């Protein structure tokens, strides 16, 4: 089991960490959602599907900078919604193929009432997402740590 980003940055067998740089909608009004869809950015595969079934959860999601300060978040994991920053590990997603498959994570961030102006700064850390991988074969239990960075400023109009 290993993962890679849309730009080819990889986290190999045994886990580790990688930076993910995301393009964000430039404008988000109060009452609207800023969508951070990681399913088009993070892809994983099972290295031995003939014998092993891999299980993948979003173990934890933390918010930083402008996201922590200016937004109220939800995380959608494989069709279900949970608070973001996270309060519990999600249920497991099965990886049973060598074909690169999306990690089904998307952040839905709506501005808090105090938000106005530059709510997210270009180049800033916005989130840390921990992918936890286990299997039905041995004791393997690995963390794939994704550091999410904003590629651009996000403005909340006033
Ligand atoms: C002859 C027996 C060969 C055993 C190979 C072990 C491969 O282990 C990697 O791939 C697994 C499947 O994706 C992951 O479950 C695991 F965590 C590890 O990444």
Swiss-Prot record:
Primary localization: other
Keyword Signal: yes
Coiled-coil features, chain-numbered ranges: none
GO term, biological process aspect, one: cell-substrate adhesion
Keywords: Fimbrium, Signal
One of the record's GO molecular function terms: D-mannose binding
GO cellular component, one term: pilus
Compartments in which it is found: Fimbrium
Entry's family note: Belongs to the fimbrial protein family.
Role noted for this protein: Involved in regulation of length and mediation of adhesion of type 1 fimbriae (but not necessary for the production of fimbriae). Adhesin responsible for the binding to D-mannose. It is laterally positioned at intervals in the structure of the type 1 fimbriae. In order to integrate FimH in the fimbriae FimF and FimG are needed.
Protein name per its UniProtKB record: Type 1 fimbrin D-mannose specific adhesin
Record organism: Escherichia coli (strain K12)
Record lineage: Bacteria, Pseudomonadati, Pseudomonadota, Gammaproteobacteria, Enterobacterales
Gene from which the chain derives: fimH
Covered residues, full protein: 22 to 179 of 300
């Amino acid at each position: 089991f290993a993962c890679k980003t849309a730009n080819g940055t990889a986290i190999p067998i045994g886990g580790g960490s990688a930076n993910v740089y995301v393009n964000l909608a430039p404008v988000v009004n109060v009452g609207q959602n800023l969508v951070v869809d990681l399913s088009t950015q993070i892809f994983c595969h099972n290295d031995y599907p003939e014998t092993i079934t891999d299980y993948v959860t979003l173990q934890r999601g933390s918010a930083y900078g402008g996201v922590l300060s200016n937004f109220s978040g939800t995380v959608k994991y494989s069709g279900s919604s949970y608070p973001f920053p996270t309060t519990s590990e999600t249920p497991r997603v099965v990886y049973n193929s060598r074909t690169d498959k999306p990690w089904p994570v998307a952040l839905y961030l709506t501005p808090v009432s105090s938000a106005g102006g530059v709510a997210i700064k270009a180049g800033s850390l916005i989130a840390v997402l921990i992918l936890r991988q286990t299997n039905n074969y041995n004791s393997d239990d690995f963390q794939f740590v994704w550091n999410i960075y904003a590629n651009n400023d996000v403005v909340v109009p006033t």
